[PDB]
Amino acid sequence: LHHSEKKYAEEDQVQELLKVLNEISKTTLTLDPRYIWRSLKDLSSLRNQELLNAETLCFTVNVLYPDSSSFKKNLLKFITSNHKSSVPGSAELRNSYPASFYSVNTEKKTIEVTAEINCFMHLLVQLFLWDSKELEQLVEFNRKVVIPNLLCYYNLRSLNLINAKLWFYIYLSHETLARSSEEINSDNQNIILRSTMMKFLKIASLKHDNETKAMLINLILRDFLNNGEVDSASDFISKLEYPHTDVSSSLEARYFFYLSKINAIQLDYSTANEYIIAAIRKAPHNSKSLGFLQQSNKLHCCIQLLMGDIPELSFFHQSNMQKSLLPYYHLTKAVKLGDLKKFTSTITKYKQLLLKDDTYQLCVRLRSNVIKTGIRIISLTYKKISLRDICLKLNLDSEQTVEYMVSRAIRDGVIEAKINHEDGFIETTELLNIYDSEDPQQVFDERIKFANQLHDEYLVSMRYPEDKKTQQNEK
């Protein structure tokens, strides 16, 4: 019973291992194993639950263990090990074959098979930890191991794609430990985590790995927003080390999401409004990306309201996620009509929901945008309007108060009007008739290069596959 369960999963694990084993040996095929490793994460997670945990026990006995003897026992110690044929050396699948890692040449240390075996061993360990939700001592123990091992080994172009997915598990397992319980050991542990990211980033820049730098930057930018340090994030994004070529669309959408929140508090929403749009377009529409689409859609509505523009209501209607968008719908109506009591009562009841995503601090700026938008509505519809006519609509304080609020928006060119104190009425200074001016021409010259932007990123991609197509023999 238990014997047939251990040999079935290990045969499938070696079958998937031998595929990427022969591809990295000859020249550089590394683009091919990258596609296999995408499905390896999903195929291993479903396989971990079946055949209990014993698939990883016999796999270590098969190959040679540099560090991995005590790590399995320590992993099996927390679960109250049940020992069945647990003596090392019970299952031997090698039997002296070249693809089986021939034992005599391996045990005599005349050849080194550890490079591809050890780096692949750490990948399967991190998968069971996140699947079984094992925390506390097992999180810190594995962090003290993998990090020193990566500094000793020299990662080639193919080897840099191994640990690239291991950096995600180091940061994820640490954040789940901090949110579960807070202590003095959690703050000091994050200090080393921030120090290790800066040392390996320089090494990854020399190898010019696209997936490695894409995974690091996404994890590094998130740490900056947790501590709230702009000076660290501002200088980091100025280098532009993030390759846009071979990175996946899921890694791109996460990159544009960070830039929207950085420029939001910098009071420049012109560039931030495009970053939140690019994050949605690059993110897939499937169910696994709903976690990113839920947060990105909530940030888009916050960016618009801070610009003075009001987003469309169909976004809160035709979508299927509107159940979570209900708190942001009441903020849409309160800004339009300019009601002061409606905005104060809206953020009071939903304050509990706004604390989770930390968007309640951005709602403080919305208190000013309620009046700024109401002035824009009445100024565009009414060209020449008196001074006291505004205070009778929005129920403002006095005539001197509204005079200062109108002169505030003309700084950035929002209202585009003038205040005449002698005559005592505000007149709109926009006569339109800009068709004869050169202002539309500035956008025209930019849209000429926008069409050519997709031209240089495309024609190259046609010949990209054609090499291996024409090199293979055709019938």
């Binding site: 987003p311 469309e312 209501l313 169909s314 719908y329 339009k336």
Partner: peptide
């Protein structure tokens, strides 16, 4: 799709226009 469907108005229903018939005879 903006300022259209659910927000509506909550005016311009009855009492506002019902008075307008009296204004024609007051001029």
């Amino acid at each position: 799709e903006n300022w259209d469907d659910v927000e509506v108005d909550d005016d311009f229903t009855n009492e506002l226009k019902a008075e307008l018939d009296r204004y024609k005879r007051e001029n």
